[PDB]
Amino acid sequence: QFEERHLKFLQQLGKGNFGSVEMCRYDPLQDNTGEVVAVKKLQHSTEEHLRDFEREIEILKSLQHDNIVKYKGVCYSRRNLKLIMEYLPYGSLRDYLQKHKERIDHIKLLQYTSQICKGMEYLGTKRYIHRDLATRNILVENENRVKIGDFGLTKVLPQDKEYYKVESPIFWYAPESLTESKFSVASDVWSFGVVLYELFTYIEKSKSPPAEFMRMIGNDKQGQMIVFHLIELLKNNGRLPRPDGCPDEIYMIMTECWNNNVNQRPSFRDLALRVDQIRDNMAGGSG
Ligand SMILES: N#CC[C@H](C1CCCC1)n1cc(-c2ncnc3[nH]ccc23)cn1
């Protein structure tokens, strides 16, 4: 779809563990008048990583939703597969919320929450598991609209099961992901609860899930024993605390998402409805 020669690098936007995203100018008219785009490429183009990247591209191209970053096309010349997507200039929600927190009230946080929920509801209709729902993977287009911005870990559920068994962001993981490496819509709901916690702490680093969990566990632990003591903590119903200023009903949603019983966690459809109702009530539909 895109031609390598016209694409001009401008600046790096983000770097993951296997890919990076660049800000580039696509200029088919060679007049520098072309659109600025975001370009994802692999750091190391091994056979494994390229096969994974191809499926990620297929996943994004199949998604069309207001709250999912827009696929544009692919670009290659010989092993230089790149994914072209719409550029969102406010960057990740983490940076945005940090910079603008004093101006972002709870009604606005719930607007972002609702948009994330509806994007995930849409993902569920395709039987996709995101596996990395966290504010680092949410992008901001404008002050009224966020989009799920990265799908590098997203899996398609197999046809015989409602879960996929597969360096992990352990402080966002459901207990069965930690113990059984099992990922499902329900483990995405668990991670969504952590996202809600991130939003209502305004991405303060001292209150981040890793900082909170390590204080609860003990900083003497490293690597494997961190995971062990996190599992024991969650099994014993230890949970992240209610953020300062967070309404109790919003914390209650977090804690329902963090149920150890997978079957007890809410659906994204129900989360979107409840968040929308809370937001409307807070804005003056109930006071
Ligand atoms: N979301 C998310 C995180 C993702 C990083 C995580 C792995 C590659 C980079 N990332 C995407 C961007 C980005 N920024 C601005 N516009 C964009 N469009 C598509 C991705 C994108 C920046 N970092």
PDB file of C-alpha atoms and ligand atoms in Angstrom:
ATOM      1  CA  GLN A   1       0.000   0.000   0.000  1.00  0.00           C
ATOM      2  CA  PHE A   2       2.803   2.393   0.943  1.00  0.00           C
ATOM      3  CA  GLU A   3       6.105   2.981  -0.846  1.00  0.00           C
ATOM      4  CA  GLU A   4       9.313   2.905   1.185  1.00  0.00           C
ATOM      5  CA  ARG A   5      11.023   5.721  -0.713  1.00  0.00           C
ATOM      6  CA  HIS A   6       8.403   8.362   0.122  1.00  0.00           C
ATOM      7  CA  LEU A   7       8.459   7.636   3.867  1.00  0.00           C
ATOM      8  CA  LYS A   8      10.746  10.114   5.836  1.00  0.00           C
ATOM      9  CA  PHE A   9      11.654   9.549   9.484  1.00  0.00           C
ATOM     10  CA  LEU A  10      11.105  12.451  11.877  1.00  0.00           C
ATOM     11  CA  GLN A  11      11.190  11.291  15.499  1.00  0.00           C
ATOM     12  CA  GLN A  12      10.786   8.228  17.702  1.00  0.00           C
ATOM     13  CA  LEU A  13       7.508   8.042  19.612  1.00  0.00           C
ATOM     14  CA  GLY A  14       7.838   4.861  21.635  1.00  0.00           C
ATOM     15  CA  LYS A  15       9.924   1.767  22.126  1.00  0.00           C
ATOM     16  CA  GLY A  16       8.690  -1.591  23.359  1.00  0.00           C
ATOM     17  CA  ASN A  17      10.564  -4.785  24.018  1.00  0.00           C
ATOM     18  CA  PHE A  18      10.373  -5.958  20.393  1.00  0.00           C
ATOM     19  CA  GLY A  19       9.090  -3.018  18.327  1.00  0.00           C
ATOM     20  CA  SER A  20       9.329   0.743  18.138  1.00  0.00           C
ATOM     21  CA  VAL A  21       6.977   3.384  16.734  1.00  0.00           C
ATOM     22  CA  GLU A  22       8.264   6.343  14.708  1.00  0.00           C
ATOM     23  CA  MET A  23       6.728   9.627  13.603  1.00  0.00           C
ATOM     24  CA  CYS A  24       7.196   9.887   9.825  1.00  0.00           C
ATOM     25  CA  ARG A  25       6.083  11.938   6.825  1.00  0.00           C
ATOM     26  CA  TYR A  26       4.495  10.082   3.915  1.00  0.00           C
ATOM     27  CA  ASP A  27       4.926  12.152   0.764  1.00  0.00           C
ATOM     28  CA  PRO A  28       3.773  10.569  -2.481  1.00  0.00           C
ATOM     29  CA  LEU A  29       3.807  13.970  -4.238  1.00  0.00           C
ATOM     30  CA  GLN A  30       7.441  14.549  -3.127  1.00  0.00           C
ATOM     31  CA  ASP A  31       6.420  18.087  -2.073  1.00  0.00           C
ATOM     32  CA  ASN A  32       6.687  17.491   1.718  1.00  0.00           C
ATOM     33  CA  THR A  33       2.931  18.206   1.827  1.00  0.00           C
ATOM     34  CA  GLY A  34       1.991  14.688   2.867  1.00  0.00           C
ATOM     35  CA  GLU A  35       0.345  13.427   6.020  1.00  0.00           C
ATOM     36  CA  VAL A  36       2.377  12.677   9.133  1.00  0.00           C
ATOM     37  CA  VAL A  37       1.921   9.032  10.121  1.00  0.00           C
ATOM     38  CA  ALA A  38       2.990   6.652  12.863  1.00  0.00           C
ATOM     39  CA  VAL A  39       5.140   3.728  11.761  1.00  0.00           C
ATOM     40  CA  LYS A  40       5.745   0.550  13.756  1.00  0.00           C
ATOM     41  CA  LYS A  41       8.795  -1.568  12.951  1.00  0.00           C
ATOM     42  CA  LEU A  42      10.652  -4.458  14.553  1.00  0.00           C
ATOM     43  CA  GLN A  43      13.885  -3.897  16.457  1.00  0.00           C
ATOM     44  CA  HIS A  44      15.109  -7.382  15.462  1.00  0.00           C
ATOM     45  CA  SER A  45      13.563  -8.919  12.338  1.00  0.00           C
ATOM     46  CA  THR A  46      13.914 -12.591  13.255  1.00  0.00           C
ATOM     47  CA  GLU A  47      11.604 -15.249  11.818  1.00  0.00           C
ATOM     48  CA  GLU A  48       9.700 -15.505  15.107  1.00  0.00           C
ATOM     49  CA  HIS A  49       9.282 -11.748  15.548  1.00  0.00           C
ATOM     50  CA  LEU A  50       8.234 -11.253  11.919  1.00  0.00           C
ATOM     51  CA  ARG A  51       5.580 -13.975  12.138  1.00  0.00           C
ATOM     52  CA  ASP A  52       4.219 -12.331  15.300  1.00  0.00           C
ATOM     53  CA  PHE A  53       4.276  -8.883  13.689  1.00  0.00           C
ATOM     54  CA  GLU A  54       2.398 -10.165  10.630  1.00  0.00           C
ATOM     55  CA  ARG A  55      -0.420 -11.485  12.829  1.00  0.00           C
ATOM     56  CA  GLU A  56      -0.469  -8.204  14.782  1.00  0.00           C
ATOM     57  CA  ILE A  57      -0.872  -6.303  11.500  1.00  0.00           C
ATOM     58  CA  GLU A  58      -3.687  -8.656  10.481  1.00  0.00           C
ATOM     59  CA  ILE A  59      -5.339  -8.042  13.852  1.00  0.00           C
ATOM     60  CA  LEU A  60      -5.224  -4.247  13.591  1.00  0.00           C
ATOM     61  CA  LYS A  61      -6.422  -4.189   9.979  1.00  0.00           C
ATOM     62  CA  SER A  62      -9.485  -6.216  11.001  1.00  0.00           C
ATOM     63  CA  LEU A  63     -10.420  -3.601  13.654  1.00  0.00           C
ATOM     64  CA  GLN A  64     -12.537  -0.526  12.851  1.00  0.00           C
ATOM     65  CA  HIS A  65     -13.629   1.411  15.934  1.00  0.00           C
ATOM     66  CA  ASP A  66     -13.627   5.019  17.156  1.00  0.00           C
ATOM     67  CA  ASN A  67     -11.465   3.988  20.119  1.00  0.00           C
ATOM     68  CA  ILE A  68      -8.952   1.802  18.281  1.00  0.00           C
ATOM     69  CA  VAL A  69      -5.984   3.389  16.512  1.00  0.00           C
ATOM     70  CA  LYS A  70      -6.567   3.489  12.755  1.00  0.00           C
ATOM     71  CA  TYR A  71      -4.690   1.054  10.534  1.00  0.00           C
ATOM     72  CA  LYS A  72      -3.556   2.709   7.295  1.00  0.00           C
ATOM     73  CA  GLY A  73      -1.358   0.216   5.452  1.00  0.00           C
ATOM     74  CA  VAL A  74       1.873  -1.742   5.348  1.00  0.00           C
ATOM     75  CA  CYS A  75       5.264  -0.899   3.884  1.00  0.00           C
ATOM     76  CA  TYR A  76       8.164  -3.092   2.789  1.00  0.00           C
ATOM     77  CA  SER A  77      10.993  -3.249   0.271  1.00  0.00           C
ATOM     78  CA  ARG A  78      13.257  -7.017   1.841  1.00  0.00           C
ATOM     79  CA  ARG A  79      12.520  -8.057   5.442  1.00  0.00           C
ATOM     80  CA  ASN A  80      11.583  -4.468   6.387  1.00  0.00           C
ATOM     81  CA  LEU A  81       7.899  -4.995   7.178  1.00  0.00           C
ATOM     82  CA  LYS A  82       6.451  -1.826   8.695  1.00  0.00           C
ATOM     83  CA  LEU A  83       2.938  -1.016   9.924  1.00  0.00           C
ATOM     84  CA  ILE A  84       1.505   2.408   9.025  1.00  0.00           C
ATOM     85  CA  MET A  85      -1.106   3.934  11.328  1.00  0.00           C
ATOM     86  CA  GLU A  86      -2.705   7.302  12.079  1.00  0.00           C
ATOM     87  CA  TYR A  87      -0.534   9.628  14.164  1.00  0.00           C
ATOM     88  CA  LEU A  88      -2.084  10.704  17.486  1.00  0.00           C
ATOM     89  CA  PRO A  89      -0.200  13.818  18.601  1.00  0.00           C
ATOM     90  CA  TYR A  90      -0.965  13.844  22.330  1.00  0.00           C
ATOM     91  CA  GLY A  91       0.870  10.527  22.734  1.00  0.00           C
ATOM     92  CA  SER A  92       0.163   8.000  25.446  1.00  0.00           C
ATOM     93  CA  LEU A  93      -2.466   8.649  28.109  1.00  0.00           C
ATOM     94  CA  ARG A  94       0.365   8.299  30.679  1.00  0.00           C
ATOM     95  CA  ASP A  95       2.197  11.349  29.385  1.00  0.00           C
ATOM     96  CA  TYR A  96      -1.025  13.236  28.711  1.00  0.00           C
ATOM     97  CA  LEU A  97      -2.533  12.672  32.145  1.00  0.00           C
ATOM     98  CA  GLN A  98       0.752  13.493  33.879  1.00  0.00           C
ATOM     99  CA  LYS A  99       1.032  16.800  32.016  1.00  0.00           C
ATOM    100  CA  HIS A 100      -2.615  17.839  32.344  1.00  0.00           C
ATOM    101  CA  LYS A 101      -3.774  16.213  35.599  1.00  0.00           C
ATOM    102  CA  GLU A 102      -4.890  19.425  37.324  1.00  0.00           C
ATOM    103  CA  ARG A 103      -7.260  20.027  34.383  1.00  0.00           C
ATOM    104  CA  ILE A 104      -8.667  16.481  34.127  1.00  0.00           C
ATOM    105  CA  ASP A 105     -11.640  16.034  36.473  1.00  0.00           C
ATOM    106  CA  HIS A 106     -13.254  12.695  37.370  1.00  0.00           C
ATOM    107  CA  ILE A 107     -16.011  13.176  34.773  1.00  0.00           C
ATOM    108  CA  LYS A 108     -13.291  13.385  32.108  1.00  0.00           C
ATOM    109  CA  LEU A 109     -11.506  10.313  33.517  1.00  0.00           C
ATOM    110  CA  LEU A 110     -14.790   8.413  33.204  1.00  0.00           C
ATOM    111  CA  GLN A 111     -15.114   9.630  29.617  1.00  0.00           C
ATOM    112  CA  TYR A 112     -11.769   7.991  28.872  1.00  0.00           C
ATOM    113  CA  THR A 113     -12.786   4.920  30.895  1.00  0.00           C
ATOM    114  CA  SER A 114     -15.985   4.529  28.878  1.00  0.00           C
ATOM    115  CA  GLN A 115     -14.084   4.787  25.585  1.00  0.00           C
ATOM    116  CA  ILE A 116     -11.556   2.134  26.655  1.00  0.00           C
ATOM    117  CA  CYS A 117     -14.416  -0.123  27.756  1.00  0.00           C
ATOM    118  CA  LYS A 118     -16.197   0.178  24.426  1.00  0.00           C
ATOM    119  CA  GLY A 119     -13.012  -0.511  22.483  1.00  0.00           C
ATOM    120  CA  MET A 120     -12.522  -3.654  24.571  1.00  0.00           C
ATOM    121  CA  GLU A 121     -16.155  -4.672  24.122  1.00  0.00           C
ATOM    122  CA  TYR A 122     -15.521  -4.425  20.379  1.00  0.00           C
ATOM    123  CA  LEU A 123     -12.324  -6.507  20.645  1.00  0.00           C
ATOM    124  CA  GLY A 124     -14.307  -9.177  22.480  1.00  0.00           C
ATOM    125  CA  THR A 125     -16.748  -9.478  19.575  1.00  0.00           C
ATOM    126  CA  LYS A 126     -13.800 -10.674  17.446  1.00  0.00           C
ATOM    127  CA  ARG A 127     -12.605 -13.060  20.215  1.00  0.00           C
ATOM    128  CA  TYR A 128      -9.354 -11.104  20.579  1.00  0.00           C
ATOM    129  CA  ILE A 129      -7.537 -10.942  23.931  1.00  0.00           C
ATOM    130  CA  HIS A 130      -5.469  -7.782  24.326  1.00  0.00           C
ATOM    131  CA  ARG A 131      -3.154  -9.155  27.086  1.00  0.00           C
ATOM    132  CA  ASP A 132      -1.544  -5.748  27.769  1.00  0.00           C
ATOM    133  CA  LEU A 133      -4.322  -3.343  28.821  1.00  0.00           C
ATOM    134  CA  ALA A 134      -2.499  -0.526  30.647  1.00  0.00           C
ATOM    135  CA  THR A 135      -2.367   3.232  30.283  1.00  0.00           C
ATOM    136  CA  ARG A 136       0.998   2.891  28.499  1.00  0.00           C
ATOM    137  CA  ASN A 137      -0.949   1.339  25.580  1.00  0.00           C
ATOM    138  CA  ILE A 138      -3.726   3.958  25.392  1.00  0.00           C
ATOM    139  CA  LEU A 139      -3.198   6.977  23.133  1.00  0.00           C
ATOM    140  CA  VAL A 140      -4.810  10.430  23.197  1.00  0.00           C
ATOM    141  CA  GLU A 141      -6.094  11.960  19.984  1.00  0.00           C
ATOM    142  CA  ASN A 142      -7.681  15.086  21.515  1.00  0.00           C
ATOM    143  CA  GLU A 143      -8.988  16.148  24.909  1.00  0.00           C
ATOM    144  CA  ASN A 144     -12.232  14.218  24.248  1.00  0.00           C
ATOM    145  CA  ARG A 145     -10.956  11.008  22.692  1.00  0.00           C
ATOM    146  CA  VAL A 146      -8.578   8.185  23.516  1.00  0.00           C
ATOM    147  CA  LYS A 147      -7.793   5.041  21.520  1.00  0.00           C
ATOM    148  CA  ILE A 148      -6.250   1.682  22.321  1.00  0.00           C
ATOM    149  CA  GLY A 149      -2.924   2.234  20.657  1.00  0.00           C
ATOM    150  CA  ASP A 150      -0.912  -0.989  20.637  1.00  0.00           C
ATOM    151  CA  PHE A 151      -1.767  -4.656  19.992  1.00  0.00           C
ATOM    152  CA  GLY A 152       1.699  -6.232  20.132  1.00  0.00           C
ATOM    153  CA  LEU A 153       0.599  -8.935  22.592  1.00  0.00           C
ATOM    154  CA  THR A 154      -2.959  -9.425  21.297  1.00  0.00           C
ATOM    155  CA  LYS A 155      -4.017 -13.034  20.650  1.00  0.00           C
ATOM    156  CA  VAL A 156      -6.931 -14.597  18.770  1.00  0.00           C
ATOM    157  CA  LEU A 157      -8.776 -17.134  20.890  1.00  0.00           C
ATOM    158  CA  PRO A 158      -8.693 -20.728  19.581  1.00  0.00           C
ATOM    159  CA  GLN A 159     -11.946 -22.293  18.495  1.00  0.00           C
ATOM    160  CA  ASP A 160     -12.014 -24.995  21.194  1.00  0.00           C
ATOM    161  CA  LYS A 161     -11.522 -22.744  24.267  1.00  0.00           C
ATOM    162  CA  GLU A 162     -12.416 -19.390  25.820  1.00  0.00           C
ATOM    163  CA  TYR A 163      -8.680 -18.754  26.811  1.00  0.00           C
ATOM    164  CA  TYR A 164      -5.246 -18.656  25.220  1.00  0.00           C
ATOM    165  CA  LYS A 165      -2.353 -20.249  27.086  1.00  0.00           C
ATOM    166  CA  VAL A 166       0.873 -18.399  26.273  1.00  0.00           C
ATOM    167  CA  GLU A 167       9.014 -10.865  30.424  1.00  0.00           C
ATOM    168  CA  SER A 168       5.453 -10.053  31.486  1.00  0.00           C
ATOM    169  CA  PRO A 169       3.797  -6.942  33.000  1.00  0.00           C
ATOM    170  CA  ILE A 170       2.990  -8.956  36.096  1.00  0.00           C
ATOM    171  CA  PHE A 171       1.482  -6.114  38.130  1.00  0.00           C
ATOM    172  CA  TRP A 172      -1.367  -5.889  35.610  1.00  0.00           C
ATOM    173  CA  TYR A 173      -1.926  -9.690  35.394  1.00  0.00           C
ATOM    174  CA  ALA A 174      -4.885 -11.661  36.693  1.00  0.00           C
ATOM    175  CA  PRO A 175      -3.931 -14.451  39.143  1.00  0.00           C
ATOM    176  CA  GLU A 176      -4.654 -17.197  36.585  1.00  0.00           C
ATOM    177  CA  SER A 177      -2.382 -15.436  34.091  1.00  0.00           C
ATOM    178  CA  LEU A 178       0.329 -15.452  36.759  1.00  0.00           C
ATOM    179  CA  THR A 179      -0.235 -19.086  37.748  1.00  0.00           C
ATOM    180  CA  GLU A 180      -1.492 -20.776  34.574  1.00  0.00           C
ATOM    181  CA  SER A 181      -0.386 -18.352  31.807  1.00  0.00           C
ATOM    182  CA  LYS A 182      -4.067 -18.329  30.829  1.00  0.00           C
ATOM    183  CA  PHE A 183      -5.417 -15.220  29.103  1.00  0.00           C
ATOM    184  CA  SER A 184      -9.087 -14.539  28.437  1.00  0.00           C
ATOM    185  CA  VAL A 185     -11.642 -11.749  28.234  1.00  0.00           C
ATOM    186  CA  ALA A 186     -11.842 -12.090  32.004  1.00  0.00           C
ATOM    187  CA  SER A 187      -8.108 -11.486  32.448  1.00  0.00           C
ATOM    188  CA  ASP A 188      -8.476  -8.386  30.248  1.00  0.00           C
ATOM    189  CA  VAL A 189     -11.236  -7.273  32.647  1.00  0.00           C
ATOM    190  CA  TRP A 190      -8.827  -7.728  35.558  1.00  0.00           C
ATOM    191  CA  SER A 191      -6.266  -5.575  33.763  1.00  0.00           C
ATOM    192  CA  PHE A 192      -8.958  -2.983  33.017  1.00  0.00           C
ATOM    193  CA  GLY A 193      -9.458  -2.672  36.770  1.00  0.00           C
ATOM    194  CA  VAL A 194      -5.774  -1.818  37.069  1.00  0.00           C
ATOM    195  CA  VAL A 195      -6.192   0.752  34.267  1.00  0.00           C
ATOM    196  CA  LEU A 196      -9.016   2.334  36.254  1.00  0.00           C
ATOM    197  CA  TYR A 197      -6.709   2.495  39.270  1.00  0.00           C
ATOM    198  CA  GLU A 198      -3.996   4.108  37.115  1.00  0.00           C
ATOM    199  CA  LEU A 199      -6.417   6.776  35.902  1.00  0.00           C
ATOM    200  CA  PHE A 200      -7.700   7.688  39.336  1.00  0.00           C
ATOM    201  CA  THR A 201      -4.171   7.945  40.749  1.00  0.00           C
ATOM    202  CA  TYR A 202      -3.413  10.272  37.806  1.00  0.00           C
ATOM    203  CA  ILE A 203      -0.457   8.025  36.824  1.00  0.00           C
ATOM    204  CA  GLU A 204       1.482   9.149  39.902  1.00  0.00           C
ATOM    205  CA  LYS A 205       4.582   6.931  39.938  1.00  0.00           C
ATOM    206  CA  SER A 206       4.773   6.564  43.743  1.00  0.00           C
ATOM    207  CA  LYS A 207       1.216   5.198  43.630  1.00  0.00           C
ATOM    208  CA  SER A 208       1.725   3.019  40.559  1.00  0.00           C
ATOM    209  CA  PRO A 209       0.748  -0.677  40.749  1.00  0.00           C
ATOM    210  CA  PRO A 210       4.409  -1.814  40.881  1.00  0.00           C
ATOM    211  CA  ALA A 211       5.284   0.624  43.678  1.00  0.00           C
ATOM    212  CA  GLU A 212       2.186  -0.288  45.707  1.00  0.00           C
ATOM    213  CA  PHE A 213       2.585  -4.037  45.248  1.00  0.00           C
ATOM    214  CA  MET A 214       6.291  -3.976  46.085  1.00  0.00           C
ATOM    215  CA  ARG A 215       5.591  -2.100  49.327  1.00  0.00           C
ATOM    216  CA  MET A 216       2.993  -4.754  50.187  1.00  0.00           C
ATOM    217  CA  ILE A 217       5.394  -7.596  49.290  1.00  0.00           C
ATOM    218  CA  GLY A 218       8.846  -6.333  50.392  1.00  0.00           C
ATOM    219  CA  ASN A 219      11.558  -4.790  48.244  1.00  0.00           C
ATOM    220  CA  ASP A 220      14.074  -7.525  49.135  1.00  0.00           C
ATOM    221  CA  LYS A 221      12.425  -9.740  46.494  1.00  0.00           C
ATOM    222  CA  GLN A 222      13.595  -9.869  42.904  1.00  0.00           C
ATOM    223  CA  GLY A 223      12.391 -11.593  39.758  1.00  0.00           C
ATOM    224  CA  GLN A 224      10.763 -14.942  40.504  1.00  0.00           C
ATOM    225  CA  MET A 225       9.988 -14.399  44.189  1.00  0.00           C
ATOM    226  CA  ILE A 226       8.217 -11.163  43.330  1.00  0.00           C
ATOM    227  CA  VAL A 227       5.801 -13.265  41.261  1.00  0.00           C
ATOM    228  CA  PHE A 228       5.464 -15.849  44.047  1.00  0.00           C
ATOM    229  CA  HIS A 229       4.682 -13.231  46.681  1.00  0.00           C
ATOM    230  CA  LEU A 230       2.327 -11.362  44.342  1.00  0.00           C
ATOM    231  CA  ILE A 231       0.405 -14.615  43.774  1.00  0.00           C
ATOM    232  CA  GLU A 232       0.188 -15.270  47.516  1.00  0.00           C
ATOM    233  CA  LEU A 233      -0.884 -11.668  48.137  1.00  0.00           C
ATOM    234  CA  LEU A 234      -3.687 -11.804  45.561  1.00  0.00           C
ATOM    235  CA  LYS A 235      -4.824 -15.253  46.714  1.00  0.00           C
ATOM    236  CA  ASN A 236      -5.184 -13.740  50.207  1.00  0.00           C
ATOM    237  CA  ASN A 237      -7.322 -10.886  48.801  1.00  0.00           C
ATOM    238  CA  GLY A 238      -4.650  -8.209  49.072  1.00  0.00           C
ATOM    239  CA  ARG A 239      -5.539  -5.454  46.609  1.00  0.00           C
ATOM    240  CA  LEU A 240      -4.422  -2.025  45.495  1.00  0.00           C
ATOM    241  CA  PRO A 241      -5.949   0.671  47.733  1.00  0.00           C
ATOM    242  CA  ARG A 242      -8.682   3.144  46.896  1.00  0.00           C
ATOM    243  CA  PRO A 243      -6.923   6.145  45.279  1.00  0.00           C
ATOM    244  CA  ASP A 244      -7.255   9.512  46.995  1.00  0.00           C
ATOM    245  CA  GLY A 245     -10.376  11.319  45.848  1.00  0.00           C
ATOM    246  CA  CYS A 246     -11.737   8.249  44.073  1.00  0.00           C
ATOM    247  CA  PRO A 247     -15.501   7.762  44.495  1.00  0.00           C
ATOM    248  CA  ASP A 248     -16.376   4.604  46.373  1.00  0.00           C
ATOM    249  CA  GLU A 249     -18.577   3.341  43.532  1.00  0.00           C
ATOM    250  CA  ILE A 250     -15.634   3.627  41.146  1.00  0.00           C
ATOM    251  CA  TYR A 251     -13.372   1.751  43.562  1.00  0.00           C
ATOM    252  CA  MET A 252     -16.124  -0.861  43.853  1.00  0.00           C
ATOM    253  CA  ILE A 253     -15.906  -1.410  40.082  1.00  0.00           C
ATOM    254  CA  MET A 254     -12.143  -1.896  40.410  1.00  0.00           C
ATOM    255  CA  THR A 255     -12.611  -4.498  43.121  1.00  0.00           C
ATOM    256  CA  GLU A 256     -15.242  -6.397  41.089  1.00  0.00           C
ATOM    257  CA  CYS A 257     -12.783  -6.548  38.181  1.00  0.00           C
ATOM    258  CA  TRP A 258     -10.184  -7.916  40.634  1.00  0.00           C
ATOM    259  CA  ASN A 259     -12.213 -10.964  41.711  1.00  0.00           C
ATOM    260  CA  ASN A 260     -10.124 -14.114  42.154  1.00  0.00           C
ATOM    261  CA  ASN A 261     -13.087 -16.073  40.749  1.00  0.00           C
ATOM    262  CA  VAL A 262     -12.857 -15.586  36.987  1.00  0.00           C
ATOM    263  CA  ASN A 263     -16.596 -16.198  36.542  1.00  0.00           C
ATOM    264  CA  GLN A 264     -17.476 -13.360  38.950  1.00  0.00           C
ATOM    265  CA  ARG A 265     -15.754 -10.584  36.970  1.00  0.00           C
ATOM    266  CA  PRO A 266     -18.036  -8.236  35.006  1.00  0.00           C
ATOM    267  CA  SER A 267     -18.311  -8.018  31.243  1.00  0.00           C
ATOM    268  CA  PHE A 268     -17.032  -5.021  29.319  1.00  0.00           C
ATOM    269  CA  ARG A 269     -20.575  -4.311  28.115  1.00  0.00           C
ATOM    270  CA  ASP A 270     -21.748  -4.108  31.715  1.00  0.00           C
ATOM    271  CA  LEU A 271     -18.731  -1.982  32.664  1.00  0.00           C
ATOM    272  CA  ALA A 272     -19.441   0.523  29.877  1.00  0.00           C
ATOM    273  CA  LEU A 273     -23.090   0.839  30.916  1.00  0.00           C
ATOM    274  CA  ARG A 274     -22.235   1.312  34.594  1.00  0.00           C
ATOM    275  CA  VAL A 275     -19.429   3.807  33.898  1.00  0.00           C
ATOM    276  CA  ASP A 276     -21.739   5.769  31.581  1.00  0.00           C
ATOM    277  CA  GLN A 277     -24.436   5.818  34.263  1.00  0.00           C
ATOM    278  CA  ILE A 278     -21.995   6.974  36.952  1.00  0.00           C
ATOM    279  CA  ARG A 279     -20.589   9.684  34.681  1.00  0.00           C
ATOM    280  CA  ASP A 280     -24.064  10.983  33.796  1.00  0.00           C
ATOM    281  CA  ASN A 281     -25.084  10.999  37.467  1.00  0.00           C
ATOM    282  CA  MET A 282     -21.906  12.813  38.480  1.00  0.00           C
ATOM    283  CA  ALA A 283     -22.392  15.460  35.775  1.00  0.00           C
ATOM    284  CA  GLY A 284     -25.857  16.286  37.087  1.00  0.00           C
ATOM    285  CA  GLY A 285     -28.266  13.564  35.998  1.00  0.00           C
ATOM    286  CA  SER A 286     -28.459  12.542  39.653  1.00  0.00           C
ATOM    287  CA  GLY A 287     -26.151  15.079  41.337  1.00  0.00           C
TER     288      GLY A 287
HETATM  289  N1  LIG B   1       0.021   2.864  22.556  1.00  0.00           N
HETATM  290  C1  LIG B   1       1.101   2.566  22.756  1.00  0.00           C
HETATM  291  C2  LIG B   1       2.472   2.216  23.095  1.00  0.00           C
HETATM  292  C3  LIG B   1       3.311   2.091  21.819  1.00  0.00           C
HETATM  293  C4  LIG B   1       4.714   1.700  22.244  1.00  0.00           C
HETATM  294  C5  LIG B   1       4.675   0.274  22.821  1.00  0.00           C
HETATM  295  C6  LIG B   1       5.382  -0.694  21.778  1.00  0.00           C
HETATM  296  C7  LIG B   1       5.760   0.233  20.543  1.00  0.00           C
HETATM  297  C8  LIG B   1       5.673   1.648  21.047  1.00  0.00           C
HETATM  298  N2  LIG B   1       3.281   3.439  21.228  1.00  0.00           N
HETATM  299  C9  LIG B   1       2.468   3.850  20.232  1.00  0.00           C
HETATM  300  C10 LIG B   1       2.730   5.179  20.012  1.00  0.00           C
HETATM  301  C11 LIG B   1       2.026   6.054  19.041  1.00  0.00           C
HETATM  302  N3  LIG B   1       2.141   7.348  19.309  1.00  0.00           N
HETATM  303  C12 LIG B   1       1.485   8.213  18.494  1.00  0.00           C
HETATM  304  N4  LIG B   1       0.702   7.905  17.472  1.00  0.00           N
HETATM  305  C13 LIG B   1       0.566   6.587  17.202  1.00  0.00           C
HETATM  306  N5  LIG B   1      -0.151   5.965  16.246  1.00  0.00           N
HETATM  307  C14 LIG B   1       0.010   4.633  16.378  1.00  0.00           C
HETATM  308  C15 LIG B   1       0.838   4.413  17.450  1.00  0.00           C
HETATM  309  C16 LIG B   1       1.184   5.644  17.960  1.00  0.00           C
HETATM  310  C17 LIG B   1       3.669   5.587  20.927  1.00  0.00           C
HETATM  311  N6  LIG B   1       4.014   4.536  21.674  1.00  0.00           N
END
